[PDB]
Design a protein around this ligand. Structure first.
Ligand SMILES: O=C(NCc1cn([C@H]2CO[C@H]3[C@@H]2OC[C@@H]3n2cc(CNC(=O)[C@H](O)[C@@H](O)C(=O)N[C@@H]3O[C@H](CO)[C@H](O)[C@H](O)[C@H]3O)nn2)nn1)[C@H](O)[C@@H](O)C(=O)N[C@@H]1O[C@H](CO)[C@H](O)[C@H](O)[C@H]1O
Ligand SMILES: O=C(NCc1cn([C@H]2CO[C@H]3[C@@H]2OC[C@@H]3n2cc(CNC(=O)[C@H](O)[C@@H](O)C(=O)N[C@@H]3O[C@H](CO)[C@H](O)[C@H](O)[C@H]3O)nn2)nn1)[C@H](O)[C@@H](O)C(=O)N[C@@H]1O[C@H](CO)[C@H](O)[C@H](O)[C@H]1O
Ligand SMILES: O=C(NCc1cn([C@H]2CO[C@H]3[C@@H]2OC[C@@H]3n2cc(CNC(=O)[C@H](O)[C@@H](O)C(=O)N[C@@H]3O[C@H](CO)[C@H](O)[C@H](O)[C@H]3O)nn2)nn1)[C@H](O)[C@@H](O)C(=O)N[C@@H]1O[C@H](CO)[C@H](O)[C@H](O)[C@H]1O
Ligand SMILES: O=C(NCc1cn([C@H]2CO[C@H]3[C@@H]2OC[C@@H]3n2cc(CNC(=O)[C@H](O)[C@@H](O)C(=O)N[C@@H]3O[C@H](CO)[C@H](O)[C@H](O)[C@H]3O)nn2)nn1)[C@H](O)[C@@H](O)C(=O)N[C@@H]1O[C@H](CO)[C@H](O)[C@H](O)[C@H]1O
Ligand SMILES: [Ca+2]
Ligand SMILES: [Ca+2]
Ligand SMILES: [Ca+2]
Ligand SMILES: [Ca+2]
Ligand SMILES: [Mn+2]
Ligand SMILES: [Mn+2]
Ligand SMILES: [Mn+2]
Ligand SMILES: [Mn+2]
Lengths: 232, 232, 232, 232
């Protein structure tokens, strides 16, 4: 079988394993800061630099994967704590959408909320234009920030959040478990056919965005990943 | 919300927080050894001593859970490496079945392979009587060791195995990710209606068994768990 | 710290983690076959597709690494069993030298035996033009196939050879252990300043070559690697 | 050539291939436990029972060797996680020093830290009396626990650690690569003249020790070794 495995306990500028897009910076403590607090419609994205073959046109086989990551969102004075982080999967040539308005688009979609990606969003602002639920939520996104499904959640300022994601290729189930600061767990699961929605080779990463009035600290602290594709 | 959370980096004999059943022993290194290598049809089980409320009869709500554990199976001289470990969920009064034949029953079922439990087995012997697949496998069990579903796997002697399990109450999906020594991940997922198959309060744990000719080292090294049931 | 880690138990075409150069093919059994048995001066190379940051101009720190691989060389009818395999490190833009004569160059050097690389060669033909010792040998190469140091060895046709390599950044020592089919171990070690001989970002891989009359099967069976660079 | 080769996937107290010294026990799971958790100044050692000829007074030739082993150190409640494991080489008549104080001596030296051995220590306590560095460290020891050289390391409780050691007789270099649970590799290398420091025939093994208030689980899980001495 074909396996891709990596583990980041910290990050650094110049690490050839990570592609930096937009307003991303690496802090002295090793954290990734995705948005620029002084910029309007800020968008910052980080990608694992190696394309991952998630499915094969030869065998028809689809990879399974296990990934865990930790993030933090922190309020800043005066601005609205917005807009959130998305863990996403996209074609290997993925770039911040041209003319990105940031905000509710989470840096992966156009103004209408459409794009080419599969993601798990940690959304902290209700965008009526994208049919967002009225509170903070975890969403499963398929080519749109108008989530296929959401679950109520709560983004706690300065709290370290742990996430575990399992993609089971046979059932095509994307399962998500979010461990909050107060100890409670939040889960969401959705059948997503990665072979039907994505190309054979993709990139995995994180994206975050803000607007003129909606800005907050968006940090990626750690990330581990393992994918295995049966080669038969 | 109502949350049950715990973490075991090690185990100990004088700990009332764990129920020890049958042939289970705690080694000086802190590992749980489930079966007795010198006994015929050995069966040993461990349970978290506090019952977990997985569903409310008042609200009809079902808990989601996230659990991770690590184990080891090791071959022993002159015996068939058998029978395997099962991570299981059962009624609070669960005990080793009366007159247990061990072996293929994995210590949770009768001779016909029936019982009252939901489990994830790591099965290292092919029992034709329970319609086992021909190789080592991971299986999702519902009141039977004749698995609802299996996936081929490989039990590596002396290798430390890591498992992550997510139960998403809304989709009723039980997702499992198994991290092998060679780095590959094995996944299996199945819709299991925990509210329909189990009582309000349940016990979580591990069981393993052997027979006259089938014996191996079955170790539980660590276990973390979090369940959250919405109380509104 | 910054760590690159991977493990290949087998290989496959289309794996974006591997760069294929020249006459390389992947066999149905998962082995990499480096040279083309029907081509004159055949040269094939495989590289880990992600550049590795072996040192940083900012801190002056140099990475340490541990790598293990297994190979096989097998005689073919009529042709001379030649020329061998080289495990090498080179600048990230590395390509088969333009107008490569293959042969004793091992696919990493020019006709004079010069190049920009550090390698460990498993040499099966004595090239007087490169001051080769009179028998099969393991050599340590620094920008030349005229080895800095060699040790007598024996390439057994159809034998699976295991290699372990340690690079200790503090002493700048490149240590090599080769486990022969007859059970004996062969070692060779040399101080090589990777910071002085190579750029900050490099590629690791294998190369093999043949000539008109010198051809043999060159197989790469498995490869594991871990490098760690201390960061500011 | 003269070659000694062996491989232990498990160990037993009833096998003549190993010598057991002091407080060493073999667990039913097959692991070697070097120290007794309930004893003051506990010392336990194991040795490969056959003496290995590492050098020749006839030819002056010195053997090369490749060895790999895996261990685990685990914290115990109320005791300082101390003192560590040492992989050592010593005269064939080697015994635990008479009146051993355990602790910082790692079971191989006297109170002043002196002894007759060459070793690789995995030290988890800073003994100012032996000029220990302030954190956990891997050290190369020549007749003293006041290491010739050390490298910062981190002993993770309950983590399985993998070690590879290459001794190259021509350069007299002892190279060590340690693979941690967080994925990073730690290396240390030192020129050590075995002919000058040790007799022709030596014993290879492991030792660990504790004190009154410094105790932890010290386990040896597996060990493979190959040495080759040129007899021509
Ligand atoms: O004066 C009067 N009315 C006041 C008024 C307001 N205005 C205007 C002036 O200008 C404002 C304002 O209205 C809208 C306009 N504007 C401009 C903009 C532009 N930016 C924007 O829209 C945002 O920036 C947008 O980009 C955005 O929200 N991004 C999101 O930000 C998020 C973070 O927050 C996330 O990041 C997201 O992802 C991202 O999408 N946003 N808003 N003009 N007049 C009347 O007299 C009144 O007093 C009155 O009637 N009294 C009494 O009434 C009685 C009723 O019975 C009786 O009649 C009485 O007789 C009568 O006396
Ligand atoms: O494969 C195996 N065995 C095969 C086997 C044999 N059998 C047969 C054997 O025989 C039984 C049975 O099938 C039915 C049969 N029988 C025979 C009878 C007939 N008598 C009766 O009923 C009569 O009535 C009789 O009693 C009688 O006549 N008196 C009456 O007494 C009265 C007194 O008052 C009056 O006098 C009356 O007049 C008088 O009639 N009734 N029943 N079935 N399977 C291994 O063992 C198996 O364990 C194994 O492989 N282990 C595995 O190992 C693995 C590791 O390698 C893993 O660990 C696995 O997990 C683990 O599974
Ligand atoms: O160089 C190359 N190609 C060209 C070439 C030509 N030749 C030479 C060699 O030899 C021939 C020929 O040119 C002419 C020469 N000859 C032959 C003879 C014959 N005498 C006769 O016939 C006489 O008669 C003689 O026999 C005689 O006198 N008897 C006695 O005479 C008495 C008389 O009284 C009595 O009668 C006695 O009884 C009787 O015994 N006289 N002269 N050699 N190489 C290679 O391809 C090169 O590219 C190469 O190596 N690549 C490497 O390839 C490797 C794999 O291999 C690796 O892959 C490497 O990395 C790669 O670099
Ligand atoms: O060290 C240990 N144990 C022993 C010990 C002793 N101490 C204490 C106890 O004692 C000392 C000292 O600290 C200070 C204290 N002191 C001494 C004094 C002297 N009094 C005085 O001076 C007074 O004056 C007194 O004498 C007095 O009042 N008279 C009158 O004084 C008058 C003066 O005018 C007139 O003279 C009168 O005539 C006369 O009657 N005043 N204060 N600390 N530790 C550890 O266990 C050790 O083994 C250890 O760490 N192991 C390590 O463990 C690790 C795991 O953690 C790893 O496993 C390692 O590998 C392992 O190595
Ligand atoms: Ca939103
Ligand atoms: Ca079975
Ligand atoms: Ca050559
Ligand atoms: Ca010490
Ligand atoms: Mn949303
Ligand atoms: Mn089964
Ligand atoms: Mn050579
Ligand atoms: Mn020390």
């Amino acid at each position: 079988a074909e396996t891709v495995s990596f583990n980041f306990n910290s990050f650094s500028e110049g690490n050839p394993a990570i592609n930096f897009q937009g307003d991303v910076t690496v802090l002295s403590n090793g954290n990734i800061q995705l948005t620029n607090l002084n910029k309007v419609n800020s968008v910052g994205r980080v990608l694992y630099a190696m394309p991952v073959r998630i499915w094969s046109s030869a065998t028809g086989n689809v990879a399974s994967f296990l990934t865990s990551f930790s993030f933090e969102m922190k309020d800043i004075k005066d601005y609205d704590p917005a807009d959130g982080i998305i863990f996403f999967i996209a074609p290997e040539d993925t770039q911040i959408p041209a003319g990105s308005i940031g905000g509710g688009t989470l840096g992966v979609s156009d103004t209408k909320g459409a794009g080419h990606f599969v993601g798990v969003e940690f959304d902290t602002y209700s965008n009526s234009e994208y049919n967002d639920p009225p509170t903070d939520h975890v969403g499963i996104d398929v080519n749109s920030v108008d989530s296929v499904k959401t679950v109520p959640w709560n983004s706690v300022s300065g709290a370290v959040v742990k996430v575990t994601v399992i993609y089971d290729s046979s059932t095509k189930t994307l399962s998500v478990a979010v461990t909050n600061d107060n100890g409670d767990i939040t889960t969401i699961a959705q059948v997503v056919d990665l072979k039907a929605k994505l190309p054979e080779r993709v990139k995995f990463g994180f994206s975050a965005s803000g607007s003129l009035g909606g800005r907050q600290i968006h940090l990626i602290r750690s990330w581990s990943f393992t994918s295995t594709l049966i080669t038969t």
